[PDB]
């Protein structure tokens, strides 16, 4: 369906983003729908700008050289694959996102730099 | 491990947002986009969520589309500002029967017509109601001390047809399954739908009309119900077939009051006339309060005896039982419905009585003269719930009195809307993961 | 072989849009933003006139312009008074006669306590008889609003251009039928400019056809669609109102005023309007021999005037100058077919309801002086009957009534076409 | 040549102009109608634009994969399409079996990226 | 030797756009988002861009929209009409006007016999005891609705994305020309929308000195817009005691008279500080001279004529509006105790010189007062042929939109244009 | 913050160019009456000018990039500065007063260069 294996396999979630990645677009009922259909343009193009100034745009999945962290998660990957759902994961990790975001931020703009003068040869 | 992206995983978190509705009248329609043949469905397996009725948004925003939809439509139509004339009414007396001895005034008064430097003199039958007396006699109408008010145009109707809030681009309407549901508390069952059920805009007052029938037992559900100040809404199992008429047989006159706007009066009764009767079975209700008192014990404690009684409300709309009735407006008893004290065919007869000026969504003047509809009107509806309220009353052998009441409009949304909250979806995550970049 | 997707191709399908004004008053050019082509080589495409989209946004959105243009002008309420009228015989034409009427009546004025006495000039298409006093047509259904003196009624160009994403398509074929498959298409960004004229029977101040005349019609065969005629050289007419009108202002209220006709400077006449005789016998004369071939050889073909109805369905009417005529035209379709001048006796209304509605009309105020006016003869709204069959005898008699139809001779080719770039083919690539 | 000037030239001829059809996308109460077309414009160039990058083939025009052409869908050769035909008529023959090619992209793309991150995690 | 494409570099051009409000009565402020908190600033440390006191769209869109929300907000209450008859007027106990006459009741038929208390400003003679109200002829308006308020409540307009708005910190910036130091924060400060003529008050001072800001200081037909540096205070009351009746018109509209004076009658008068006044006219006669003469007479006269907006000082005191005369003030001559000004109020106001619609004020009981500080002025020139070393600059007004340019001076909005390219021998490969 | 380094060095406001790009679209802060509409038509404004400006990487194959080189020369009548004095000593807001003119022909060298670029690119997967 659309999102119905939100509490499936962590694992067997990951096969399904597709069919979830696609329903983000889709006078009383005047400005009201035109400011429903322009707050949801507002959202999907923020999403899209942040995977594009990470550098991961165009994919859905994504893989990164940021190190994680034993502080962020001291469970291993035999229990968080296998066993847990994305909904118990980010009730875990609500409040740890930010840091995460900037030096996701911080290794692309320290990447490309690295980069421009590689082909200057 | 290492820190990877994912874009759109099944993660949603609450918020509030402007909802839509579609269908297949006051309630605009066609404004509206139509919706789909064959509805989705989709049930979220294995999963808990921490649902509340008695805080959503969507009753808010569902009040303030009502009341937007319903000032709308209004505003095309008669304003009637000529229409308070000193009026000068004498009694009916021609086919009384005992009973509305006092309450139909003829009124004799005279209007502007097409032209402007010319008066006509016409008539018409007026409830007691909407006449005050002004010091045969000088009354004047009720309105004109506050506000003058519009006449609703005779096409649109006042019939409640489904309406169906979706879900925005981006968002998700989730609804609880659980049956033994109180509100407040977790759902264990959640299923993901994109547009909530037929949810009819009907009004009520003590006895909330068509409507979803609980499938479990009577549910008596509260915020505070140790509170003395909270409305209790107790939703039934088997609904209460209710008959309501009006047995008088009205004519519409026409008296046309300026260049383009006219004015229905009632003319004369073409027969006799009589209360507008309401009927409800003897053992329906004794069993369907038998219900409630039984779910109440257990709650309200184990050896009570639970007392019902009628309203003591001043004003017209709380202590009665209003509806909407085929277009004319009902006023009723709901007294010698209620009047039992249970301890550890037959019909009751409700006298309705009907009122044209509308002073309705509790404001302190917009009114709307209501048209007289030509012949007998009959309604066939089910009782689906109930407002009580209980008293200040603390002690003195568990005795409970569980007075009618109301007053707020959002309590009849909140016995529909009470299995649904909007929640927006945030698709970023992020994981640990074996990769890392090239 | 394997599949690759491309984005940016050149197809497209029909679909209906919005389409936003654009020009270069009545016709508000504030909100139209101010305002090139490119040739198609070997396309050919299905080209529909009468299941058209363009013409139907045009002409709802010419009648809510058209509405919205009247809001803030004088509503006219204390008007409907009773009237006392009377004749006026200032050294009136004997055909002329009857037609204007002295009026006088009590109504208001800036002080809400007091009232005076006015006289004013009314026609006869405007008063009814009280069932001697007189009241206004319009105080029967609608009071309405009249006309401010600022905006004037010039049908001023205007452009419909389609937003991005759409393609507006053009016909350049010279011999058009107005349907089947048009053998040159060129696009462009939007049209060349229509004048939104009013007319009933003969199409005024229009596109004239560049080689032969054109005959239109959605099925010739049935009597209940109308034959659209469309010229190759135009023909000149005169309006015509020769009175001194003086318009006096009159205040009804704090604020707003009534504009009333006051007298007549001079001798009253009729507002005729001239036709030429050579021009128009010579222009019939090409839609009689033109029309022949859809209908048969050696075939009678006979004018004969309207039928019945309304007055402005039954006679020609247009807006020159800034008063309504309403002229016969009896005269021009009276031929049988096997420096003289045609002229054509014209009388005015002043309450006018436009588009065909009940319960909305608008009061047209005078215009002081004389009225010259010149326009153009460029087509023709023709309708035939249902004649026996094998009679070699068909009468034709000018229609209208709807307004779709006068903007229909314009709207005939173009259509709007929705681009979708997306699209799929085999190629021998693959991925690595 | 214009905005669709090589809509009469043939398949290999007008795969060489797609930029400039791709560049012209995205160009007083009752002003309501500037502004609704310009988010209906929008939403149809994000649905595409979306639809483009699901299967792995966005910000390229000239995208190929390797998905292979069943014959089921057209069965005439490729030496007679590519220039004795216009994209129009490549429009209609393949107005139908569309939905399915429209899938069948979406879940080769998600398998490759399956791979993607398999192959890269040892 | 190849072309690279930078996407996101700092460059922008000036542009016109349409902003909105922002803040935490009349002015809309519960319609705006809440504030964003202290917006930090740079520094352009090698910037000759030019900035415009006179020519930018912020000042035009204030206008327009200050005009738009006041249309707005009159709408939805008592529109009179009826009270447009004939009036039997005496005198009192000679300015005001003791006037009856026959208005309307709730019920169509009956009519009653009131009476109310009218100015002389606002009334005029019909052809002695038969007046009429002044906008008979020309309107028929609305009250003020008595629960607004007319309050200057603080108004902040924020920029949306892709424009950002800078900021000029230069203190001998005179409004046009390259200031050498540019700023730039999310958006502005507290503008308050107050209505004045010849006396701004209530606004934001000076730096270091007193500036004087003209298109061209050699034409008689572009004012001086002197904004002061030191706050002058003025303070006034009306010591009337008014009462207000509620006069019933017709089905629940109502008409707000004024009733009788409960003690005794005495003219409203607006006084300021002698000493201050002296030296801060000094100040703008020292700094002035800069710019016409170091060798020249200033001298002072009080306003030119025409209208009643537009010779006298004219403001807002809690809902009456004064029209004081403030011509004890500009008269000096300057060569090489306080001052009671006489004022006089009026009902029915024309406000953004507009004809075809006015609007009523209701009385407001009880005696009103005010603070205020006066920073700025509004002088223009009346000039001559070249024979005399005298110069005559009379105040002026009437203008609305330079009270406005007052504020937002150093403000200027740019768009954005993030996409840039550069030489570099470096290839795509 | 917001236009940091803006009168700084061409070289280190290279650096400095990701946080310009995260308020091209909106903040998230401001995400019937006179202010409402008028925000609505800034809100679409902002999302048309982001567009215009994204569909411009797309085409000339820098999508997703913020640095990137592509493969036409440039011509040596549109500068005659070398590389030593342009990246450093020099304002980004000088550098665009002179490619008033030259900024429209050479847009259309990059996406002539990137059409035949991803034609070659293409030709040689059929093999
Ligand atoms: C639902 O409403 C009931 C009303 O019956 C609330 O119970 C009463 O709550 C009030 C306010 O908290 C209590 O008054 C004060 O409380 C504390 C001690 O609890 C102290 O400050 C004072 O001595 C005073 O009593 C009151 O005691 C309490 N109980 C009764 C029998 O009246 C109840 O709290 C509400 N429920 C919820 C969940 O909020
Ligand atoms: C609860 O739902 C029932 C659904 O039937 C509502 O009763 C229906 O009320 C409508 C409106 O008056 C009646 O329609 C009218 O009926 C006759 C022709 O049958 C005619 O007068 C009108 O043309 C109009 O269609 C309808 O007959 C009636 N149906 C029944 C079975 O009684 C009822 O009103 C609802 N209760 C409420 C809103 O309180
Ligand atoms: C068809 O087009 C002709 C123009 O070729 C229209 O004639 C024009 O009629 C208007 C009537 O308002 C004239 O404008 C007015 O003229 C005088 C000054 O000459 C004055 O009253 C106004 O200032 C205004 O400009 C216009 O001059 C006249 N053009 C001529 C005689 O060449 C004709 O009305 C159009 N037909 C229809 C049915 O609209
Ligand atoms: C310039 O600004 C000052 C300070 O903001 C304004 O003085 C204030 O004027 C208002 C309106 O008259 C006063 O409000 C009123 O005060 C009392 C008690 O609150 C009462 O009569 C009313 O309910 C009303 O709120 C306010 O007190 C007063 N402030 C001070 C500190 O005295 C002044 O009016 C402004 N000048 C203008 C608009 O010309
Ligand atoms: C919720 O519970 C179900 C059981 O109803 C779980 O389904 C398991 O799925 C795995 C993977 O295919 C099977 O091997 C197990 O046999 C299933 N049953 C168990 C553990 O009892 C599942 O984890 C959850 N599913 C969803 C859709 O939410
Ligand atoms: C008319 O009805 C009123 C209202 O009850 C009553 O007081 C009065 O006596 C009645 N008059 C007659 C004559 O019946
Ligand atoms: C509602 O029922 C839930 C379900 O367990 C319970 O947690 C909660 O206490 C109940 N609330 C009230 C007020 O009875
Ligand atoms: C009140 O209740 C008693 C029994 O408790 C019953 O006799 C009486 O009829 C009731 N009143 C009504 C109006 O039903
Ligand atoms: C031309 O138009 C006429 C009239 O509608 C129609 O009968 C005829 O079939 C058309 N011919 C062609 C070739 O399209
Ligand atoms: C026509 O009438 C006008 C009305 O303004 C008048 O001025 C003019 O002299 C008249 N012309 C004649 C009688 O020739
Ligand atoms: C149109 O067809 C002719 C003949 O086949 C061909 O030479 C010409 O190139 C075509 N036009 C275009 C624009 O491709
Ligand atoms: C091709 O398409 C047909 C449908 O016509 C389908 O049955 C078949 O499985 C597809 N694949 C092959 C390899 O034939
Ligand atoms: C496409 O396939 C459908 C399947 O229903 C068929 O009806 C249709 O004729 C086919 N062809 C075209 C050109 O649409
Ligand atoms: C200011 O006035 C002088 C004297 O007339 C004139 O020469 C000058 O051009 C004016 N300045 C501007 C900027 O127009
Ligand atoms: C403002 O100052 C600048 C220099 O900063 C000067 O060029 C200009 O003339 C001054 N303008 C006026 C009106 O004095
Ligand atoms: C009013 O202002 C005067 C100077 O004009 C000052 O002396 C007095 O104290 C002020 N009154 C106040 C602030 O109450
Ligand atoms: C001038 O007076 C006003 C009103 O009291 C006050 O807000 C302002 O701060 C004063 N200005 C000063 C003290 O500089
Ligand atoms: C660019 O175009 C403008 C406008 O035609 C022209 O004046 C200018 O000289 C051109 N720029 C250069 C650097 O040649």
């Known amino acids: 369906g659309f999102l119905g294996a939100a509490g499936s396999t962590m694992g067997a979630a990951s096969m399904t983003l597709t069919v979830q990645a696609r329903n983000l677009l889709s006078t009383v009922w005047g400005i009201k729908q035109l400011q429903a259909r322009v707050l949801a343009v507002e959202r999907y193009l923020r999403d899209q700008q942040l995977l594009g100034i990470w550098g991961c745009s165009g994919k859905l999945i994504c893989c990164t050289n940021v190190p994680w962290n034993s502080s962020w998660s001291n469970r291993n990957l035999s229990e968080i694959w296998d066993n847990m759902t994305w909904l118990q994961w980010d009730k875990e990790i609500s409040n740890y996102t930010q840091i995460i975001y900037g030096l996701l931020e911080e290794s692309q703009n320290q990447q490309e730099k690295n980069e421009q003068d590689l082909l200057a040869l | ?438």
């Open chain 2, 1 to 438: 491990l290492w820190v990877t992206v994912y874009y759109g995983v099944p993660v949603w978190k609450d918020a509030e947002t402007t909802l839509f509705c579609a269908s297949d009248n006051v309630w605009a329609t066609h404004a509206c986009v139509p919706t789909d043949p064959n509805p989705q469905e989709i049930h979220l397996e294995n999963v808990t969520e921490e649902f509340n009725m008695w805080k959503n948004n969507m009753v808010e925003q569902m009040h303030t589309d009502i009341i937007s939809l319903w000032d709308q439509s209004l505003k095309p139509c008669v304003k009637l500002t000529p229409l308070c004339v000193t009026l000068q009414c004498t009694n009916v007396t021609n086919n009384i029967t005992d009973d509305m001895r006092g309450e139909l005034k003829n009124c004799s008064f005279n209007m502007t017509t097409e032209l402007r430097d010319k008066k006509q003199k016409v008539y018409s039958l007026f409830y007691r109601l909407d006449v005050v007396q002004i010091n045969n006699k000088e009354y004047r109408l009720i309105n004109c001390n506050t506000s003058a008010c519009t006449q609703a145009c005779p096409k649109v109707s006042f019939e409640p047809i489904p309406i169906h809030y979706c879900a925005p681009a981006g968002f998700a309407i989730l609804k609880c399954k659980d049956k033994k549901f109180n509100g407040t508390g977790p759902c264990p069952s959640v299923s993901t739908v994109q547009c909530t059920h037929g949810i009819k805009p009907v009004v009520s007052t003590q006895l909330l009309l068509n409507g979803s029938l609980a499938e479990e037992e009577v549910m008596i559900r509260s915020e505070n119900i140790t509170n003395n100040a909270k409305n209790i809404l107790v939703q039934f199992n088997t609904p209460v077939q209710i008959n309501c008429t009006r047995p008088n047989n009205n004519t519409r006159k026409s008296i046309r009051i300026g260049p383009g706007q006219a004015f229905y009066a009632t003319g004369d009764i073409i027969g006799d006339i009589r209360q507008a009767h309401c009927n409800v079975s003897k053992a329906t209700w004794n069993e369907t309060l038998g219900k409630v008192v039984k779910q109440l014990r257990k709650h309200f404690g184990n050896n009570t005896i639970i007392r019902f009684a009628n309203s003591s409300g001043g004003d017209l709309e709380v202590t009665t039982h209003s509806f909407n009735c085929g277009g004319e407006f009902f006023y009723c008893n709901t007294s010698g419905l209620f009047n039992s004290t249970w301890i550890s065919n037959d019909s009751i007869t409700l006298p309705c009585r009907i009122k044209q000026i509308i002073n309705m969504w509790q404001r302190i003047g917009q009114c709307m003269y209501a048209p007289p509809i030509q012949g007998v009107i009959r309604c066939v509806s089910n009782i689906t719930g109930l407002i009580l309220t209980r008293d200040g009353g603390s002690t003195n052998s568990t005795t409970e009195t569980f007075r009618p009441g109301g007053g707020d409009m959002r309590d009849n949304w909140r016995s529909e809307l009470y299995k649904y909250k909007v929640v927006k979806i945030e698709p970023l995550g992020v994981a640990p993961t074996r990769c890392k970049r090239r």
